[PDB]
Design a protein around this ligand. Structure first.
Ligand SMILES: CCCCCCCCCCCCCCCCCC(=O)OC[C@H](COP(=O)([O-])OCC(O)COP(=O)([O-])OC[C@@H](COC(=O)CCCCCCCCCCCCCCCCC)OC(=O)CCCCCCCCCCCCCCCCC)OC(=O)CCCCCCCCCCCCCCCCC
Ligand SMILES: CCCCCCCCCCCCCCCCCC(=O)OC[C@H](COP(=O)([O-])OCC(O)COP(=O)([O-])OC[C@@H](COC(=O)CCCCCCCCCCCCCCCCC)OC(=O)CCCCCCCCCCCCCCCCC)OC(=O)CCCCCCCCCCCCCCCCC
Ligand SMILES: CCCCCCCCCCCCCCCCCC(=O)O[C@@H](COC(=O)CCCCCCCCCCCCCCC)COP(=O)(O)OCC[N+](C)(C)C
Ligand SMILES: CCCCCCCCCCCCCCCCCC(=O)O[C@@H](COC(=O)CCCCCCCCCCCCCCC)COP(=O)(O)OCC[N+](C)(C)C
Ligand SMILES: CCCCCCCCCCCCCCCCCC(=O)O[C@@H](COC(=O)CCCCCCCCCCCCCCC)COP(=O)(O)OCC[N+](C)(C)C
Ligand SMILES: CCCCCCCCCCCCCCCCCCCC(=O)O[C@H](COC(=O)CCCCCCCCCCCCCC)COP(=O)(O)OCCN
Ligand SMILES: CCCCCCCCCCCCCCCCCCCC(=O)O[C@H](COC(=O)CCCCCCCCCCCCCC)COP(=O)(O)OCCN
Ligand SMILES: CCCCCCCCCCCCCCCCCCCC(=O)O[C@H](COC(=O)CCCCCCCCCCCCCC)COP(=O)(O)OCCN
Ligand SMILES: CCCCCCCCCCCCCCCCCCCC(=O)O[C@H](COC(=O)CCCCCCCCCCCCCC)COP(=O)(O)OCCN
Ligand SMILES: CCCCCCCCCCCCCCCCCCCC(=O)O[C@H](COC(=O)CCCCCCCCCCCCCC)COP(=O)(O)OCCN
Lengths: 155, 111, 438, 51, 127, 536
């Protein structure tokens, strides 16, 4: 994928038009965008308007994710408190969903140096499954535990 | 031999000429000690007794350099593990000689 | 924003026209007005504007000022802590110097231009040379140390700013620029390395704090160290992220080494002010490392911990100043029986020392938790290293408290009405932040 | 970014490349290239000659 | 009388102080103490570190002898004369999941090898 | 209703320690015990509602206590069966200690501050026990740590008391650091701090080791037991609270609340701590020290039982609750003996006319410690010893610890009462008010109720053991008690000396660890910042 200077300047002109259309009507939610500005730029920093708008969209999304995770945690805690000793069987699904939400929130914007948050040990379990499959098929002896059905309340 | 300097009513005056010593803030100062003062001076001015000896070089290198080396080695190991964990290509670090240009993961790209 | 900047420019201006006898009263009223204007700036800052809450320009790129999350917290902290410094200082000369230093520092935080940032922060260079080197209670050595360290670091930052202004054509933060150059990154970094004390460039701080007046020490620890985090968030991470990621093993080595060596050095201290200064150096390392991780958890944690330090260190420096006024000594060996002799000073001292040790009901706990979580997000070993070595702070603090707590003393050295008035805002703010209103 | 929610800086695609565009239509260079003397002295091939 | 008892005051320093005088804790009462008792000066009971080490050398083998047998010499089959508690299949499968459980040592079970490998799990998180 | 208990204790703390000038010494002697009585009524209601009738309740005070990005924790209280049982025991012991302090601390200048610290200490213990998330537990853990620092070092003009407090603080810092690391591991890989979602079937060894290292601090296990013996510098009411419930129990509570422990480690560490503590208590000549070593031994038994079986957590908590009553009684009686005789040494005690209530309470507490059949201590200890038979190593060590426990306990009982008078012919007296009698009535009531109500559901469940193996703990206890009455010599002078020096853990720390710490500080400062890098 290569971007010619003609295409780059064309996109720049289109971006300016998008800014002009946004400027025409006042919006109190200008910095809480519901949709990103789609682009094929090598670096987002090239188009400043796209960079700022998309950053504001990403912040909005992350805030929403954090609140969704809090909601998921509240339903998991209520479910756990209602069932009693049947919590392990009945709250597997809610827990699975909560852990998925935690991963989505943490992983989306972890940062340049941060590792992926393995909520539920899904990645570790997957790695152990691959290692087992390889050892068994190649006749090797695995020095690691075999993959587990359940490693956490959900995942 | 003593008198109350402070006046709550606000009519405070310093009787500089009073025979009796005012009970001012100086009343509660702690008496210093000739030997403690010299200890304080020696402790602060400890650069004067510094001498470059093999024992000094050994101790400095072993604890300061040794800790710095251990810390760098641990950080490098953790970076290598994270790169393997994340699935990112070996990153071009400053002192690492890597024939790869990877530094910052692309947010759009799926690793 | 405009009201805050105007009040900031009025505070140095007011001194020129005062009666020379009303100076202290006018300065206090101006400081409170600046605090109220900062509250107004907070009120007029909508969270809906996610990137920058407010930006104002007065005709040039240099006069571009704006407030962000880091800027807002630091500016509110400076306005909150300045009245205490004002009341603690007496004399027109001292007031003039302090008010000029404060105006320069407060203008630096909100500046969005690197060259303007440099112009405003380094204006208060001679004033610190003169303040730390005052006739009877000052040391020329400390003044020379702080001045030379600041000049060399800021000159490197200036060279990097000049290259960025030449290459990109602008040095304003609001214009998105990225650089992969390592020389320019190092130039910007060296300022942060020196200003926020990091081993081995931390020697200037303890000397300055010990030989500075209590108002000066309070201002220095409270906000001058924080100016590094504003430069990092506003002038380093946006442009030189690639170099922070490239050098992360080295950054981590230097930050952890600073934390360890500073903690060990605090153990050999016999002066209360030096103990508080070395505690600050140790605390700065976590903030620096957390911000360098370039994660949401790290930037928020670093700013929060900075506020907690900017609320806990001024308290300890204020109590130390009060004790020194009462006794004319800072040697822990001479100070004994303070529990029995000063039950009210002792209670506040113990409370602030507990805050410095990051106990749960203090802001330091929440801040530390967030910073440690950010480190754990990077690597588990990174967090573990910092968590384990925290015991060294406990050993020195416990030894100091134990030496001060008991013994035989023949002098009643307790705080007056003025001293309690000066710490009450700091106590209330500490409590409020501790309960979670961060 | 100047926010506390997302990492600062940005990311550039490694796959996508931008074709180089000349700084100007015509390039006039006032910087002379290294002399043959400089290259001769810099040649470290034979240690004795270099020394 | 708990309160108001006589005390002896430590004499004021009258000679040049040693550089490492911070190792001594003196509150003004006569018996000052080291920062850590036993670091220097009189040792309690006149027992050196060498004496304590020789004692621990004599004691350690006798204390470790019970533990070494069962943990190392003994095996799952021979440790106890019975098998671990037997549970219904639904209960047993869930209980086997716990690494710190007691049902993983059931040799009679056809899943013994997997359970044993589960018990000797990972030292650190892989991710 | 559930919140009320914590409110009453924190109110009593604020009132006595901030408004003591108005309330007075008598005002603290009223507000303290009154608040503790009200908290006992609330704790009893909580115990009946949750434990007996299986009704757990969650009270969320406020949300978003910490809200940085994904990390979110709330101040919430979940009263589960473990929380109710511990709340009840803690409040009962604290109410007794508050009643005791009215007469014991009359001769102390700050009785208002002492009462304030005792009530804040009890409040932080109830926060730790009732927390629904790991952060609330940490808040309680640190609060008890700080209150212990402020209470052990209450006598500031004694260098020993300040050093004992510094020791406690440092050891507890190392432990809470390991706990913070474990909580970070658990938050990262499970997504939450709440115990409901915290559940993980398989945990990496690192988290288990970190959890154990964190727990061994408060529950003074081997290598971390140095602070407990030193904590004797503080006033007697402090020692009763810390040893019986507030501090030693927290580690066990943490291990039982989150079952991340490893069977191999807990069993060996526990059995070792039981034996070492009993041996250390054999050499000890201070009354208060012997009861501390006894606490260490019992903690060893509770830690060891977790390894034996699945019900080990229930057995441990049952022993913990049974132990708190008798151990508190032993400390309060020891304090009264010291106060009446002005002596701390076992050699100078002897038979002397006293109060029937105190002598009986001491005898019954000692019998519970010893293991006398048909007593609360007996059932809770036999439940452990009988179930530990499967682990051959743990069982042998625990039986030997039972022997040593019986020997020192019997020796102490003989020395305090049966032995002829050993103090001097001087006028000494401590008159006991009705408040002290109420305190001993409360302790005896707890001891009696424990027999009727029991400690664990599985307490009387059959352990399928031969009769000779089931009744051996009794024979070993009797043999030790008989040997202790005869005051016979068991070990050579070399070992008696070794045990008197507590194994030389502190001599090792001073000669090597402290010297290394201060050499690192010397290199860091004198050689470097103020040497190489300092201008002439
Ligand atoms: C229109 C309607 C009217 C409304 C009003 C609006 C008008 C607007 C502005 C008008 C206000 C009047 C301006 C004041 C002029 C004189 C001020 C002065 O002499 O200072 C001391 C003077 C105190 O006099 P004094 O106590 O009677 O004794 C002095 C004796 O003469 C000698 O005493 P000494 O020998 O013992 O010296 C001891 C010395 C100790 O020795 C030192 O420390 C020397 C250090 C060298 C300079 C300090 C370097 C750092 C200064 C940083 C600048 C401070 C602001 C920080 C903000 C950052 C800006 C980038 O300590 C001091 O002097 C004070 C210490 C701090 C003051 C330094 C700040 C002054 C900078 C330059 C002054 C302007 C002079 C211009 C001359 C004009 C014709 C000659 O005035 C003050 O009250 C404090 C300073 C007020 C500063 C405001 C001045 C603006 C300078 C900021 C630069 C920004 C550009 C200018 C634009 C301003 C707005 C357009
Ligand atoms: C780590 C391993 C253990 C660390 C040290 C272990 C052994 C160290 C061996 C080195 C040594 O013995 O140094 C003593 C020696 C001083 O002699 P002295 O026996 O102490 O007394 C002489 C004075 O009269 C003394 O009179 P004074 O008392 O009045 O002066 C005292 C002065 C004397 O101090 C100095 O002159 C040098 C101070 C910094 C030295 C820089 C690195 C030296 C060692 C680093 C690597 C060691 C590995 C071996 O100290 C200061 O006040 C200045 C320090 C304030 C700035 C703080 C900046 C610290 C930067 C690095 C700290 C050192 C690393 C340890 C901490 C690690 C943290 C990363 O220092 C040096 O000579 C420097 C050695 C290397 C300098 C860097 C290369 C210079 C570049 C020149 C290139 C030539 C350009 C050609 C064009 C020329 C025309 C312009
Ligand atoms: C010189 C001093 C002399 C005077 C002493 C003053 C005495 C102070 C009394 C101590 C106060 C104890 C109360 C602690 C709770 C703090 C109150 C609080 O924060 O108000 C909460 C409301 O919550 C409550 O009211 C809590 C109930 C308080 C009393 C309930 C039981 C009292 C027992 C104390 C145990 C509290 C344990 C909490 C540990 C964290 C605000 O509600 P939100 O809108 O959700 O605020 C947002 C949350 N956040 C702060 C994080 C931003
Ligand atoms: C969590 C929800 C509710 C929170 C309530 C907490 C309980 C009360 C907290 C009150 C304020 C907390 C800190 C008070 C200031 C710290 C100083 C202090 O506690 O004691 C002072 C003085 O005490 C006071 O004047 C104020 C104390 C009033 C209430 C204190 C209750 C215990 C403090 C709770 C610990 C704080 C928790 C922080 C970490 C979780 C010094 O005492 P000593 O060093 O022992 O010397 C006294 C003299 N003598 C030698 C004879 C012993
Ligand atoms: C091997 C370590 C395994 C577990 C580590 C946990 C504890 C290790 C060492 C415990 C030191 C804590 C004890 C302490 O703080 O109390 C000292 C205070 O001592 C100090 O403050 C000196 C500093 C010691 C603290 C740290 C030194 C050991 C560091 C461990 C490793 C060194 C470096 C390793 C990594 C930095 C008071 O001494 P005592 O006389 O015994 O007081 C008791 C009261 N009585 C008078 C009645 C006897
Ligand atoms: C003149 C100035 C200096 C002179 C004196 C210097 C003497 C110091 C020399 C030894 C210092 C400690 C040893 C660390 C470096 C050892 C060799 C470096 C090579 C290396 O990276 O090997 C790694 C060492 O293990 C590691 O990753 C680190 C293990 C040791 C760290 C923990 C030890 C102490 C812990 C204290 C806390 C410090 C760290 C806190 C985070 C493991 O090899 P690899 O698998 O990574 O392959 C990577 C390819 N070589
Ligand atoms: C009746 C009278 C009551 C007497 C005493 C009570 C005093 C106030 C009590 C409650 C008021 C709490 C406000 C204190 C600071 C809270 C700031 C805050 O959390 O909001 C942030 C605003 O952004 C900002 O930038 C705010 C900047 C200004 C905050 C103060 C900065 C420090 C100034 C000195 C410290 C003193 C503080 C008091 C954004 O919060 P978020 O986006 O992170 O999400 C929230 C979850 N964390
Ligand atoms: C292509 C070039 C090749 C390299 C060639 C290098 C040649 C030299 C380069 C050195 C440049 C550094 C400038 C600082 C010199 C050290 C300070 C002078 C020492 C001194 O005695 O100053 C006294 C007080 O200074 C103090 O108290 C300050 C203490 C020391 C200051 C620490 C320096 C700042 C940090 C150093 C590096 C930081 C980052 C580096 C990127 C004042 O003396 P006086 O007024 O009484 O005069 C009377 C005459 N004796
Ligand atoms: C020895 C440990 C290093 C100490 C530093 C520890 C932590 C500092 C990290 C700061 C973070 C950002 C700074 C970016 C790079 C600075 C140092 C990185 C390490 C380094 O030196 O890498 C070098 C490249 O950097 C460079 O080429 C530039 C080096 C810095 C220049 C020094 C002074 C510059 C001052 C200029 C003022 C402003 C100028 C603006 C025009 C060579 O590494 P390599 O890639 O060649 O690997 C070949 C090895 N086999
Ligand atoms: C049941 C679980 C186990 C609980 C505790 C078990 C501890 C067992 C470790 C001791 C057994 C092996 C000891 C090493 C062999 C040494 C034999 C003689 C010792 C000797 O000659 O030098 C000593 C070295 O100290 C030493 O011996 C220190 C080495 C100890 C290694 C660190 C282990 C932690 C020890 C904690 C408690 C042990 C207390 C007594 C060691 C005294 O040296 P010096 O001071 O006279 O030298 C002069 C100062 N220039």
């Amino acid at each position: 994928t290569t971007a010619t200077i003609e295409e780059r300047r064309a996109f720049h002109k289109e971006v300016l038009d998008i800014v002009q259309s946004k400027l025409a009507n006042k919006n109190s939610e200008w910095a809480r965008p519901e949709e990103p500005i789609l682009h094929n730029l090598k670096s987002e920093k090239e188009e400043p308007h796209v960079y700022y708008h998309n950053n504001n969209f990403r912040v909005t999304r992350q805030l929403i994710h954090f609140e969704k995770t809090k909601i998921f945690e509240d339903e998991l805690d209520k479910c756990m408190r209602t069932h009693g000793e049947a919590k392990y069987r009945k709250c597997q699904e809610i827990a699975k969903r909560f852990q998925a939400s935690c991963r989505v929130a943490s992983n989306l914007e972890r940062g340049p140096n941060a590792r992926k948050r393995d909520v539920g040990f899904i990645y570790q379990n997957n790695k152990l499954r691959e290692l087992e499959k390889d050892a068994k098929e190649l006749g090797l002896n695995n020095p690691f535990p075999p993959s587990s059905p359940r490693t956490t309340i959900g995942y | 031999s003593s008198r109350i300097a402070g006046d709550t009513t606000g009519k405070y005056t310093p009787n500089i000429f009073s025979p009796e010593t005012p009970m001012d803030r100086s009343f509660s100062h702690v008496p210093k000690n000739p030997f403690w003062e010299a200890w304080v001076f020696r402790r602060d001015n400890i650069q004067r007794e510094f001498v470059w000896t093999w024992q000094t070089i050994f101790d400095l290198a072993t604890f300061v350099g040794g800790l710095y080396v251990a810390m760098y080695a641990t950080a490098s190991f953790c970076s290598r593990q994270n790169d393997k964990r994340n699935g990112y290509p070996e990153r071009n670090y400053y002192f690492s000689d890597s024939k790869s240009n990877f530094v910052i993961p692309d947010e759009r790209e799926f690793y | 924003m405009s009201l805050y900047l105007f009040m900031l420019f009025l505070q140095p201006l007011s001194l020129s026209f005062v009666s020379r006898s009303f100076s202290k009263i006018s300065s206090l009223m101006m400081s409170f007005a600046t605090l109220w204007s900062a509250v107004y700036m907070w009120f007029t800052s909508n969270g809906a504007n996610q990137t920058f809450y407010q930006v104002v320009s007065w005709g040039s790129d240099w006069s571009t000022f704006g407030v962000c999350y880091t800027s807002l917290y630091i500016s509110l902290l400076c306005a909150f802590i300045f009245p205490i410094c004002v009341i603690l200082v007496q004399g027109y000369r001292a007031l003039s110097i302090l008010i000029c230093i404060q105006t320069a520092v407060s203008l630096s935080i909100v500046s969005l231009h690197m060259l303007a940032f440099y112009a405003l922060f380094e204006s208060s260079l001679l004033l610190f040379f003169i303040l730390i080197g005052r006739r009877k209670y000052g040391s020329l050595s400390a003044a020379y140390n702080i001045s030379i360290y600041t000049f060399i670091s800021a000159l490197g930052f200036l060279i990097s700013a000049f290259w960025l202004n030449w290459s990109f054509g602008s040095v304003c933060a609001l214009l998105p620029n990225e650089e992969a150059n390592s020389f320019v990154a190092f130039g910007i970094f060296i300022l942060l390395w020196v200003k926020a004390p990091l081993v081995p460039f931390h020697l200037w701080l303890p000397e300055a704090h010990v030989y500075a007046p209590t108002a000066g020490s309070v201002l220095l620890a409270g906000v001058l160290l924080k100016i590094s985090i504003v430069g990092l968030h506003v002038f380093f991470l946006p442009i030189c992220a690639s170099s922070i990621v490239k050098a992360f093993p080295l950054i981590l080595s230097i930050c952890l080494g600073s934390f360890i060596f500073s903690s060990f050095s605090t153990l050999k201290q016999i002066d209360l002010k030096k103990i508080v200064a070395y505690s600050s150096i140790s605390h700065m390392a976590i903030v620096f490392l957390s911000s360098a991780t370039n994660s949401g958890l790290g930037i928020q944690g670093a700013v929060l911990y900075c506020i907690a330090h900017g609320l806990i260190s001024p308290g300890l420096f204020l109590l130390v100043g009060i004790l020194y006024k009462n006794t004319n000594t800072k040697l822990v060996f001479y100070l004994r029986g303070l529990s029995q002799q000063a039950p009210v000073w002792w209670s506040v001292w113990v409370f602030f020392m507990l805050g410095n040790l990051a106990f749960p009901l203090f802001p330091n706990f929440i801040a530390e938790v967030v910073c440690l979580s950010a480190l754990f997000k990077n690597h588990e070993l990174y967090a573990y290293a910092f968590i384990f070595f925290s015991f060294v702070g406990t050993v020195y603090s416990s030894t100091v408290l134990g030496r001060l707590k008991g013994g035989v003393s023949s002098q009643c050295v307790d705080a007056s009405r003025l001293d309690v008035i000066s710490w009450n805002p700091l106590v209330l703010a500490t409590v409020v932040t501790g309960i979670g209103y961060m | 970014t100047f926010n506390y929610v997302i990492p600062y800086g940005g990311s550039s695609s490694y796959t996508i490349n931008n074709e180089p565009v000349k700084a100007e239509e015509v390039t006039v260079d006032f910087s002379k290239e290294p002399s043959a003397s400089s290259l001769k002295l810099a040649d470290k091939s034979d240690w004795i000659a270099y020394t | 009388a708990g309160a108001g008892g006589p005390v002896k005051l430590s004499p004021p320093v009258d000679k040049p102080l040693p550089y490492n005088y911070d190792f001594w804790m003196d509150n003004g009462i006569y018996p000052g103490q080291p920062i850590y008792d036993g670091m220097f000066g009189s040792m309690v009971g006149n027992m050196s570190l060498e004496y304590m080490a020789k004692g621990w050398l004599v004691l350690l083998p006798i204390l470790s002898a019970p533990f070494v047998y069962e943990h190392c010499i003994a095996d799952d089959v021979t440790r106890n004369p019975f098998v671990p508690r037997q549970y219904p299949s639904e209960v047993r499968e869930f209980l086997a999941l716990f690494k710190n459980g007691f049902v993983l040592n059931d040799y009679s079970q056809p899943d013994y090898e997997e359970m044993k490998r589960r018990q000797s799990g990972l030292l650190t998180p892989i991710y | 209703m559930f919140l009320l208990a914590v409110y009453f204790l924190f109110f009593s703390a604020i009132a006595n320690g901030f408004f003591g000038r108005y309330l007075g010494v008598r005002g603290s002697q009223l507000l303290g015990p009154s608040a503790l009585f009200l908290a006992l009524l609330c704790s009893g209601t909580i115990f009946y509602e949750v434990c007996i009738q299986g009704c757990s309740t969650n009270i969320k005070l406020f949300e978003n206590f910490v809200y940085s990005n994904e990390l979110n924790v709330s101040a919430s209280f979940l009263y589960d069966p473990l929380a109710a049982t511990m709340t009840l025991t803690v409040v009962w012991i604290s109410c007794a200690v508050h009643a005791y302090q009215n007469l014991y601390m009359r001769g102390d200048g700050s009785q208002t501050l002492f009462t304030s610290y005792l009530s804040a200490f009890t409040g932080f213990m109830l926060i730790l026990v009732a927390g629904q998330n790991l952060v609330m537990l940490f808040i309680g853990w640190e609060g008890i740590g700080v209150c212990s620092y402020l209470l052990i070092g209450y006598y500031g003009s004694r260098v020993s008391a300040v050093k004992s407090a510094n020791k406690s603080l440092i050891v507890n810092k190392i432990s809470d650091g390991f706990l913070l690391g474990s909580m970070l591991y658990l938050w990262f890989y499970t997504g939450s701090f709440s115990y409901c979602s915290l559940a993980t079937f398989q945990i990496p060894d690192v988290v288990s080791i970190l959890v154990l290292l964190g727990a061994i601090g408060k529950s003074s296990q081997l290598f971390f037991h140095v602070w407990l013996a030193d904590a004797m510098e503080g006033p007697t009411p402090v020692s009763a609270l810390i040893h019986a419930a507030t501090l030693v129990t927290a580690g066990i509570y943490v291990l039982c609340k989150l079952n991340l422990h490893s069977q191999s480690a807990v069993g060996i560490l526990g059995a070792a701590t039981a034996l070492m503590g009993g041996l250390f208590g054999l050499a000890a000549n201070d009354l208060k020290r012997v009861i501390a070593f006894s606490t260490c031994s019992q903690l060893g038994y509770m830690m060891a039982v977790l390894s034996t079986c699945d019900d080990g957590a229930d057995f441990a908590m049952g022993h913990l609750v049974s132990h708190a009553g008798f151990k508190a009684t032993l400390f309060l009686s020891a304090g009264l003996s010291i106060a009446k005789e002005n002596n701390n040494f076992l050699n100078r005690y002897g038979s002397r006319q006293g109060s029937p209530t105190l002598s009986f309470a001491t005898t019954i507490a000692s019998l519970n410690l010893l293991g006398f059949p048909e007593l609360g201590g007996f059932y809770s200890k036999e439940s452990i010893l009988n179930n530990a038979y499967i682990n051959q190593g743990v069982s042998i060590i625990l039986t030997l610890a039972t022997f040593l426990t019986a020997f020192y306990t019997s020796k102490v009982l003989a020395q305090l009462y049966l032995f002829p008078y050993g103090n001097g012919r001087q006028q000494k007296s401590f008159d006991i008010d009705a408040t002290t009698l109420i305190c001993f009535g409360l302790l005896l009531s707890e001891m009696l109720l424990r027999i009727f109500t029991g400690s664990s559901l599985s307490q009387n469940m059959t352990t399928n053991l031969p009769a000779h193996i089931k009744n051996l703990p009794f024979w070993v206890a009797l043999s030790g008690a008989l040997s202790g009455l005869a005051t016979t010599n068991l070990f050579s002078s070399n070992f008696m000396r070794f045990f008197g020096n507590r194994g030389g853990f502190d001599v090792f720390y001073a000669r090597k660890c402290s010297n290394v710490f201060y050499h690192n500080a010397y290199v860091s400062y004198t050689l470097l910042d103020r040497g190489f890098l300092k201008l002439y």
